[PDB]
Design an enzyme around this catalytic site. Sequence first.
Site, PDB file in Angstrom:
ATOM      1  CD  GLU A  11      -2.946  -1.108   0.476  1.00  0.00           C
ATOM      2  OE1 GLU A  11      -3.761  -1.990   0.333  1.00  0.00           O
ATOM      3  OE2 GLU A  11      -2.967   0.017  -0.188  1.00  0.00           O
ATOM      4  CG  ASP A  20      -8.299   3.890  -3.831  1.00  0.00           C
ATOM      5  OD1 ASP A  20      -8.902   3.150  -3.064  1.00  0.00           O
ATOM      6  OD2 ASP A  20      -8.694   4.075  -5.044  1.00  0.00           O
ATOM      7  CG  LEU A  32     -12.088   3.981   1.402  1.00  0.00           C
ATOM      8  CD1 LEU A  32     -11.615   4.632   0.116  1.00  0.00           C
ATOM      9  CD2 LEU A  32     -13.078   2.924   0.984  1.00  0.00           C
ATOM     10  CG  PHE A 104      -5.647  -4.192   4.595  1.00  0.00           C
ATOM     11  CD1 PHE A 104      -5.188  -3.301   3.631  1.00  0.00           C
ATOM     12  CD2 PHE A 104      -5.614  -3.803   5.935  1.00  0.00           C
ATOM     13  CE1 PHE A 104      -4.628  -2.084   4.011  1.00  0.00           C
ATOM     14  CE2 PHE A 104      -5.021  -2.622   6.315  1.00  0.00           C
ATOM     15  CZ  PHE A 104      -4.608  -1.719   5.344  1.00  0.00           C
ATOM     16  CB  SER A 117     -10.369 -18.556  -5.352  1.00  0.00           C
ATOM     17  OG  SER A 117     -10.581 -17.870  -6.575  1.00  0.00           O
ATOM     18  CG  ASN A 132     -10.880 -19.556  -9.689  1.00  0.00           C
ATOM     19  OD1 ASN A 132     -11.337 -18.819  -8.767  1.00  0.00           O
ATOM     20  ND2 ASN A 132     -11.646 -20.020 -10.667  1.00  0.00           N
TER      21      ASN A 132
END
Length: 164
Positions: A11, A20, A32, A104, A117, A132
Site C-alpha cells: 500500500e 487510490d 480508505l 484488507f 478460489s 482461478n
Amino acid sequence: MNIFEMLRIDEGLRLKIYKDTEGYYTIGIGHLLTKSPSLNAAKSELDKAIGRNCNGVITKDEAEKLFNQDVDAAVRGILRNAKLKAVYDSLDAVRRCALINMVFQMGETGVAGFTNSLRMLQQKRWDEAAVNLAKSRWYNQTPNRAKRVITTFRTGTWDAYKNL
C-alpha cells in the site's frame, strides 16, 4: 516478514489525502476514507477518524495507529465470517497472511465472493487456485500486487516480497 511489513509494501505510506488506484480518497497505509467525490467529505471523514482537525494531513504516528486498527479489523472480520474462517483455519501461517491482505484490500464481502478460489484453497490445490484467482477484475486492475499475493498462496513462502 509479517503482515505489517507485507502490507506496507503493497500500500505504501502517504501523510496527505490521496486518491487510490480506484480514484477514492485515502490516507496513510491504504486507509480508505470515502468513496465520495468530495475532498470535503474526505476531509471530514479524516478529522472524524483522527479526532482532530487535520486539514488533510496526518503524522506517521497517526498513520500507524490507523494501520493497527485496520489490520485488527481485517482479522476480526475473517474470524466472524463463516466461509472466511473455515478457510483461514485450514491454512498455514504464510497463507493466512495472504488472505488477510485480500481482506484488507477488498473487504470481507469482496473476498467472500471468490467462492471457487476459496474452495480450492481449502482443498490445498495451490496451482489451481492461483490460476482461478487471476481471473478477476482484481488481478486486471492491480496486477503486480495481485501477483505478489497469488504467489504467496501458490508457494506458501515470502518469496514475492523478498525482493521488495
